[PDB]
Amino acid sequence: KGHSAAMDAEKLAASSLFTWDFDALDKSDEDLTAVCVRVFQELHVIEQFNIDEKKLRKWLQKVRTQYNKNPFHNWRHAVMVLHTTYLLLTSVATEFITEVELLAMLIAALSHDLDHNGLTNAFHINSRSELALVYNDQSVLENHHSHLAFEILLEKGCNVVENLDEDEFKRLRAVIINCILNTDMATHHTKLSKMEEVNRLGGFINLAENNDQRLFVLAVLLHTADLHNPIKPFESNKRWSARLQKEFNNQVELEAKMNLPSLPFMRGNDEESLAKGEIGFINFVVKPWHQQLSQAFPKLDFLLDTIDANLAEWKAIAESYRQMQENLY
Amino acid sequence: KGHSAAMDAEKLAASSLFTWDFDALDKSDEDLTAVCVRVFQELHVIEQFNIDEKKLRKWLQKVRTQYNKNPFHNWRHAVMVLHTTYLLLTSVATEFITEVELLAMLIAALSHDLDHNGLTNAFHINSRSELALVYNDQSVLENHHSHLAFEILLEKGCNVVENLDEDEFKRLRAVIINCILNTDMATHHTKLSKMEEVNRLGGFINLAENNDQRLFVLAVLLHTADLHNPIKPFESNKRWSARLQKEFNNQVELEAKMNLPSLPFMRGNDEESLAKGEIGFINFVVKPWHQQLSQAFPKLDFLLDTIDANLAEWKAIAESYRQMQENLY
Ligand SMILES: [Mg+2]
Ligand SMILES: [Mg+2]
Ligand SMILES: [Zn+2]
Ligand SMILES: [Zn+2]
């Protein structure tokens, strides 16, 4: 029965947990567990919902065991999205997000890629996979992730939301479903267009009262945290991007063995292809997204300087390879 | 006094001997003898060097009696490496290998693991064995194999190279020594790095004239044939891998009785440990090796599809055991 969640951003930002340079690749298994628990603890959701910390840790374990050992879409990617969501909500959402929606964003971020196998939605649709048949080609993977999120959560020993009442769980369920389904890259352009129209009209007006407009912002922020590669230091940008390229190469190899069409961008398997793909992805997807995001939330415009520094680095790598490839001609 | 060995790959590939599905475990003792003789006969080395077939058969017998009844490193493993070497040379080497080097590759492949006792080089060095003292910790087993190869060969009734002149035997001896010594797994990474640099420069250029570069390729090919497990049908992959695991388990048992350190990968003695070890060995050793090999010799890239099929099979086995082990937690 509160107006907004119990958060003071400046106390939260003073913690050693608050660092935009966080990279799960440099953390051990026990370190990642501590990060997830610390996010829940420092955001006060454990005490606000009387969360059994034995169920929280059991739920965390069950979440990790349902992620697969993929190069990119793995348990460390989930923790990266959880931690980045914690950074984004602390920066801009402290005064309109509710307590239940805050708990929902933490669960959704950690659960958003459950049981990923390093294959894209196009593979499932083209191969007519069992998952594609279940979901009738509609956001196949994201529907699968959200389903397993609740199958794991509603289990008795992992029920971290056991103390929520009917109305609170209904809102938590709606927030998790909408935010995970909006991690589908096929819905990126629609959210970008709506953000542009909102920015044309001056911006968001009283988010604490407009429930549907507040949910849109939460979906926008989780999608932002999902694309964490270009907003991290370049060493983090390069290691994760090289891991995604490995998944792309494995899919093309599987698609050829199954006589399925492949997209030409996924075929590149060297450093020059990596840099060229990152330049295009940043110039046409990430940068226009954060330009609209920084206009609605100017506190986040420092991310544009991180995106530009990484973009300048990838262009230096591409220029070196092109300078070596032009001499053949 | 020839430019290259007298071989036409397409005539050779039409023989019933040419089959990548060959497995020595399914052959009788007399069948294996016939396979070894047929390799020598069909490659024309018997007539090219006027080989006394009574000495060839006596040499074959003496080779077999110097192999021990190990689960993996036995006489059938030697025939597997001989036959796989015959497949590899027929596929890619017909136009640069010389007649003497061809005969040397057949002898080296059959002799490459002589008097193996199912124990690794690390055991000899750690136990300060007599063999480790003889060879000053340098490629202990491989030096031992090559020594016995010539002790068996230079015997009068087994001298299959009696008709070679001085220059031809000197090259044959150099090829056998270098190729057997390069079966030392401790030299795998160095050969992989050189193959990567050669592939960066466009590939091998006129191997028929560069003697040292041609010897490197022969060493690369014999090492390829030594690791025949992942490039065979899965039933062959599993039976031989289970035999190697038995040797690993026997060594750890011997090392504990002698108060010697043991590597943790050798302790696994069940099917789940077998699958986990094969996935790691294929992902980090075999697959990167054949990716470089297929880039220098694209005719061999079908082996990558065999490696992937076996890798997918081992991952299905590991997933079943993990799905049964995660429910305890
Ligand atoms: Mg996803
Ligand atoms: Mg050996
Ligand atoms: Zn994701
Ligand atoms: Zn061997």
Residue numbers in the entry:
A (entry chain A), B (entry chain A): 380 to 708
From the paper:
Enzyme rhodopsins comprise the N-terminal rhodopsin domain and C-terminal enzyme domain, connected by a linker, and function as light-activated enzymes. Rh-PDE derived from Salpingoeca rosetta (SrRh-PDE) was first identified and exhibits light-dependent hydrolytic activity for both of cAMP and cGMP, whereas it lacks pump or channel activity. SrRh-PDE consists of the long N-terminal region, transmembrane domain (TMD), including the rhodopsin domain, C-terminal PDE domain, and 76-residue linker region connecting the TMD and PDE domain. Here, we present crystal structures of SrRh-PDE–TMD with and without the linker region, at 3.5 and 2.6 Å resolutions, respectively.
We next determined the 2.1 Å resolution crystal structure of the PDE domain with the linker region (Linker–PDE, residues 347–703). The N-terminal residues Lys380–Met386 are newly observed as compared with the reported structure, while residues 347–379 are disordered. The Ala385 backbone amide forms a hydrogen bond with the Glu478 sidechain, fixing the N-terminal residues and extending toward the dimer interface. The TMD–Linker and Linker–PDE structures provided insights into their connectivity, but there is no observed density to assign residues 354–379 in the linker region. The C-terminal residues 380–386 in the third α-helix were unwound, as similarly in our Linker–PDE structure.
